[PDB]
């Protein structure tokens, strides 16, 4: 793990500050409850945007791996990025193909559809070549 055991335990404790019913997910109602206890007043639409920033499976709620995306974007490492790029780019040509992205998703037990993979490549593919090179990969991970 890149994160230490103490870190994962800590961030799980933070997650349960929002997941007050302990069902493993953070809802817009739970997010709103914490935000108003800290003196804010988000709208229901603004709660939806906050979840949509990190909702990776599109089910409208934040699970713990999604929550770590908020934790990483909260406060921020370029050797881990090179190393991770190589996991994606398995034939070593410096480009992540749709097939290589599907392979990462399969090895991680992530369910996949062509629509979602094609969208992921499209959004990262700044130069329009149909694949994701290293600099396109950096912009995606660090933003």
């Amino acid at each position: 793990d890149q994160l230490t055991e103490e870190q994962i335990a800590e961030f799980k404790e933070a997650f349960s500050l929002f997941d007050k019913d302990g069902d493993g997910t953070i809802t817009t109602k739970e997010l709103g409850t914490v935000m108003r206890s800290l003196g804010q007043n988000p709208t229901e639409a603004e709660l939806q945007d906050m979840i949509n920033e990190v909702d990776a499976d599109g089910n409208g709620t934040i699970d713990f791996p999604e929550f770590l995306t908020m934790m990483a974007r909260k406060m921020k490492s370029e050797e881990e990025i090179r190393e991770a790029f190589r996991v994606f780019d398995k034939d070593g040509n410096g480009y992540i193909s749709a097939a290589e992205l599907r392979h990462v998703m399969t090895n991680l037990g992530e369910k996949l559809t062509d629509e979602e993979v094609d969208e992921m490549i499209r959004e990262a593919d700044i130069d329009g070549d149909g694949q994701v090179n290293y600099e396109e990969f950096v912009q995606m991970m660090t933003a």
Partner: peptide
């Protein structure tokens, strides 16, 4: 899926690639 959803999904895969212990039920 949308452009916000795409970026969220890339970053989730990054977390999972770097932290194998987070894959699966446990």
């Amino acid at each position: 899926s949308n452009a916000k959803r795409a970026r969220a999904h890339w970053q989730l895969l990054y977390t999972l690639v770097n932290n194998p212990s987070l894959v699966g039920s446990r």
